[PDB]
Write an enzyme that holds these catalytic residues in place. Structure first.
Site, PDB file in Angstrom:
ATOM      1  N   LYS A  47       0.909  -1.390  -0.026  1.00 17.85           N
ATOM      2  CA  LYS A  47       0.026  -0.098   0.054  1.00 17.85           C
ATOM      3  C   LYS A  47       1.087   1.146   0.023  1.00 17.85           C
ATOM      4  CE  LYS A  47      -3.656  -1.794  -0.378  1.00 17.85           C
ATOM      5  NZ  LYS A  47      -5.017  -1.604  -0.615  1.00 17.85           N
ATOM      6  N   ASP A  99      -0.196  -0.273  -4.565  1.00 14.87           N
ATOM      7  CA  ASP A  99      -1.446   0.053  -4.655  1.00 14.87           C
ATOM      8  C   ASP A  99      -1.775   1.245  -3.960  1.00 14.87           C
ATOM      9  OD1 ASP A  99      -4.450   0.564  -4.559  1.00 14.87           O
ATOM     10  OD2 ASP A  99      -4.412  -1.608  -3.631  1.00 14.87           O
ATOM     11  N   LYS A 102     -12.669  -7.825  -8.329  1.00 18.24           N
ATOM     12  CA  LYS A 102     -13.080  -8.213  -6.752  1.00 18.24           C
ATOM     13  C   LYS A 102     -14.695  -8.264  -7.183  1.00 18.24           C
ATOM     14  CE  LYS A 102     -10.414  -5.201  -4.219  1.00 18.24           C
ATOM     15  NZ  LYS A 102     -10.271  -3.861  -3.703  1.00 18.24           N
TER      16      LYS A 102
END
Ligand code: NPQ
Ligand code: NPQ
Ligand code: NPQ
Ligand code: NPQ
Ligand code: MG
Ligand code: MG
Ligand code: MG
Ligand code: MG
Lengths: 367, 367, 367, 368
Positions: free
Chosen positions: B163, B189, B263
């Site tokens: 992240k 990300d 997702k």
């Protein structure tokens, strides 16, 4: 499960009338059927190849050969098998889409029967019935055509598709339009008969408000279709060119197609056909179900496929009797311009063994 | 079928370690569960919404609300119901995709249990196990991150995802790369934390040979992402922006994405997710399975999805123990970097119902 | 100042006539009102969410919930507040634009009242009155609609907008064009009812000289609208799609829109609406004021907005009595086809409390 | 509301150091001030024109002349004045953007003072202080430049902008980079001094990591700037060419600009400048606030403007003392690299009358 073997049958069926296309006239339909055998029981596949390589490069004797010697042996050698796994197991063999699709259908029908699940359920149906159009050959005369179209209209087919070719395009359309008016759903189908040089002739179809012209140019000419679309008003539909979901995606990016005809055997099976539906849906491209003059097994599978959401134009899946006096399954009967979606496990139809036997010309076991 | 109703449960489960992202830290994972009950038996869905509207506009109380008052009723009022039919039944309701996805998931698990068929089979799995990466949060100091990373590589995880946010990007990546070398599969990300104005900063990732940068800009800025891709060497991956097969096709047409994170909840369902996979495959775009820190139910559904053929990069579907000391179902265990695909009917896993209850918060029956 | 707190009321007012749209029928208007309270004084905001998520993902209950638990608190925790500062203070929350806009409207009316300044003056009005059109719902029959339209022209409304849906488009338009002729400014609005598959139907609008067609396709299908624009003569106008000045810039760049409908709440506030207007002006794109059947609080603000220089087409801000017997403020009354721009501080209008009382259904105080 | 009249002043302020650009040197700042008088009170506007037409076609005597004979009469003939209505009232007059924007500033200052509202609040400020860079002139020698840059850095300016021209581009940037390192925010500005034929010279700036090159080509060469961007690594910034929000949309659409310098006078006023800010933000284009060596009045309005959310790069709004020993308002003083945003009604500052008088060379009343 492990597939035990496959039984391959040659089958010949008379046509109620001769069916004439830009590449010739057939009077009979020959086809291969496959019967896959598992510990679980059985499944039916129909191959859509024709007798010789006039529609595409694949043909009955060629399908049978690649089936006996490559495709079937590769599945019999596999540890566990699944419809979805058919594609990767057959991947090393280039093309032979119709043969692959036939065999995938039979594995799929066996699998699904074993889970008491219909083809409609697996494919993602949202409809219990579908609207049906009709495909009409080239004729010797305009009046033989008008009476033929007239007849089909009376039984309540919702759309008329006319086979065309140089020398039979503008006139037959003009005359169908003058006799039956601007409200009938009317489209044309060249099976690759024209070239880009014929554009001004295909422009003479502009005033008649057709839904589409299907495959005006050769299979490999996708850029040519995009070029032709800049020059004619009639929307382009592709058939022979759409060999896979990737090919549909390519055609759509290139501006070569506004509407896609789907034939499962043409794209390598019902699973790939669904992908084609979905890729088209994602790009806002309407699809419709094409017909290869299948018997009742293929018609059942097509009726199911045709009830997916993006099928928003009437397909070519006409009733059994548009082609055959006697089908090999329970026939499909038109009913308010519609056919019903089959309901039981797998295809939801099987061959009636007395009827199948009358029309079987050869039978071989591969085990 | 006809659905009887749905037990909507609020749950809450502690995490091995707090999880810090560009939008915040959560220390605990709160979710909805749906247990749908039909005549044919029962299925489980998991909702992927988090506690507040920080990742997307959808959140726990908001899902639960639209579910109770809109969605679950529209399904209860339906004559026949299939997984496939959920979408058109719920179509009049704009948005609420994660909610619709949790519901479809519950219907689907019901349907498939009623046919003794796995999620893997229905979706088209080609593989028994999937390779697995891990997501690593923002940490307080570089050495705290370098240890966490060290650890997961020791457990045999195949890719690292970090992240990132303004303040925490070039240095962590430089450090991970100095400590662990160039062969490690590494990506970052941002959860929408940058603007196009930060391109020079993002271009400072160019020498570390990252696989991708996932969602650098806001969810709506598709064109911005295509602009950004002209300015940096790291391939763009999209997540928040990919809300449907249509949005994937849009982004790919626009050059806004080279790799898609799937997702299932975000796109409104496992069925839509399948369509996103096929659309990407048809354009040659690799996909990977994303993770919303789901329980073993959603994890079972995701690993099945991740075994589809176009999933060609490591997913975020990490071992159960990466997030939870104990899961609500049989735990998933890393084994040579892979997770194995569930075998039984439907999800192939079910809540151990003692375990559910230790972690449940509320229950309501809609009927 | 610092915000002391907010009073949220639910309100419900009968409609003079039911209002039919491609997504349903409205007989009553349910809405949230906000009264923001500061040491200085107070301001009024209106939410434009409708009863359920049929127009966008936002609805009355979900607005209220995001307001109470996220939006209002984050403003109360704030040291200094200005209308301009609302946006960055609520930025961490995705979406909920209609809710954010209701809140910014309340803060703005407080702020402006305290400086003794009209909404008009803040926004940049250049006109004392604005021309008004009327939106006409889907009718049961052609003659009924022909009577309704006839009524609205007689009152002196300057332009007619007809709601349309598959089944109700070419006929109504033809009809309206037969009775009232080619000089009446006429346009249509689908609220997302078509797909790109319906292009031939929408091109059947070509001969009737419509000013525009508003949102023919779904909110997310921006590229689909540019495709559709290549296929029909009627200019495309977007509504649901234009959720920000950035979304308007993108849609313009892609060729997806030629005229923009501005709705303050849809775009997340009057201040964002001002940006939308300036972005379109800079690209030579005309805007017009859309209407969300607001009470006279919203209408006052919309009329102020509609008097900006780039609103060069007649808006949907009809007289109070086109929807309401009894407005909750001194009513807007059409006069030579114009509404006059409010003059006093802030909205220049406030709820008459006797009236606001008969129509209130609930009240809660957040502090 | 009718405008009662406008007092027009000529003002001359010495510069602490002469300022050299690709179009010349200035050692004195000559400017126009306007005091608009309404029944609701007074407001101040500052015209940014320079003495002669060397930066754009407008200059002090041209701006005065068009103000007295065209712009001010049209506003005095009007039935209702608000700042927003200034644009349509003057729309028939082509160009003269700096002159119009000076007049709009004064009108807006008067209207905002009357409502007790700041420029910051009217424009949409979201920050109380703004980071500041400094613009550095062309010098005679590198060591003189390095001393000057060295001085501004010690004072805490957060970014250095170097004026450049043929003969003074690669070398100064090389030196500045060798003396002060790769970390300093560094950028250049040509004021139109190059042509596309000079792309090879300008690509020689590639190794130095500059934030931007400002206006390398002429005002009208928007297409040439898009071509230049295909040839060089340094992001292009436009200044002279950005004359309105529409011109910003156009240059962005054409690929001619990555970053926009906003100067409110150059675009015809602070309201248009708010519009340029919004157009750029809708397209992802960062902006930064430019400086025309304003006195405290224009400096106050520019700091307010610079605090809008899409100003994500440091502006040229330096402290008063970078230019002027004595400002005519309360001066702007740098503090941790920032300037604070003014707070009271209108500009938030006003001329100290004795200081304004020391520096006024002419005054005329223009009434009905
Ligand atoms: C159904 C339709 O009208 N034509 C099919 C192809 C077709 C054409 C000729 C055939 C001859 C023998 C057997 C099958 C055949 C199929 C098509 O869409 O092109
Ligand atoms: C798997 C991964 O690294 N993150 C998710 C985001 C995410 C999703 C759900 C969450 C729930 C609780 C706390 C943080 C969360 C972060 C993603 O890929 O963007
Ligand atoms: C003025 C115009 O025609 N309608 C709005 C939308 C709209 C439609 C239906 C509604 C029903 C109940 C409450 C508010 C509503 C708003 C539009 O342009 O799309
Ligand atoms: C602050 C900055 O470096 N220069 C401005 C313009 C400028 C240049 C030269 C001037 C000479 C006398 C008066 C005003 C002037 C303004 C610019 O960006 O181009
Ligand atoms: Mg064909
Ligand atoms: Mg992500
Ligand atoms: Mg609308
Ligand atoms: Mg400059």
């Amino acid at each position: 499960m492990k597939l035990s073997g496959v039984e391959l049958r040659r089958v010949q069926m008379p046509l109620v009338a001769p069916f004439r296309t830009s590449f010739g006239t057939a009077s009979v339909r020959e086809l291969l059927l496959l019967r896959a055998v598992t510990p679980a029981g059985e499944g039916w596949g129909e191959c859509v190849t024709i007798a010789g390589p006039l529609y595409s490069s694949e043909y009955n004797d060629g399908a049978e050969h690649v089936l006996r010697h490559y495709l079937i042996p590769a599945l019999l050698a596999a540890e566990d098998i699944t419809a979805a796994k058919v594609t990767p197991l057959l991947a090393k063999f280039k093309g032979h889409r119709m043969a692959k699709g036939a065999l995938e259908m039979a594995v799929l029908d066996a699998e699904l029967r074993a889970h008491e699940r219909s083809f409609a359920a697996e494919l993602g149906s949202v409809r219990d019935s579908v609207p049906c159009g009709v495909s009409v050959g080239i004729m010797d005369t305009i009046p033989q055509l008008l009476d033929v179209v007239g007849g089909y209209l009376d039984e309540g087919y919702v759309r008329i598709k006319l086979k065309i070719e140089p020398g039979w395009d503008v006139e037959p359309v003009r005359a169908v339009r003058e006799r039956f008016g601007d409200d009938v759903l009317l489209q044309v189908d060249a099976n690759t008969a024209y070239t880009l040089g014929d554009a001004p002739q295909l422009a003479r179809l502009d005033p008649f408000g057709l839904l589409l012209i299907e495959q005006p140019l050769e299979e490999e000419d996708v850029l040519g279709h995009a070029e032709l679309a800049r020059r004619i008003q009639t929307p382009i539909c592709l058939d022979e060119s759409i060999v896979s979901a990737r090919a549909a995606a390519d055609a759509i990016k290139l501006g070569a197609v506004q509407i896609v005809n789907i034939k499962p055997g043409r794209v390598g099976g019902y699973l790939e056909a669904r992908r084609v539906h979905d890729v088209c849906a994602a790009h806002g491209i309407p699809v419709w179900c094409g017909d290869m003059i299948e018997t009742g097994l293929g018609r059942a599978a097509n009726v199911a496929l045709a009830s997916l959401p993006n099928f928003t134009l009437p397909g070519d899946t006409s009733a059994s009797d548009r082609y055959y006096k006697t089908d090999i399954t329970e026939p499909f009967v038109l009913s308010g311009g519609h056919l019903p979606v089959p309901t039981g496990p797998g295809l939801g139809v099987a061959p009636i063994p007395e009827l199948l036997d009358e029309v079987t010309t050869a039978k071989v076991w591969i085990g």
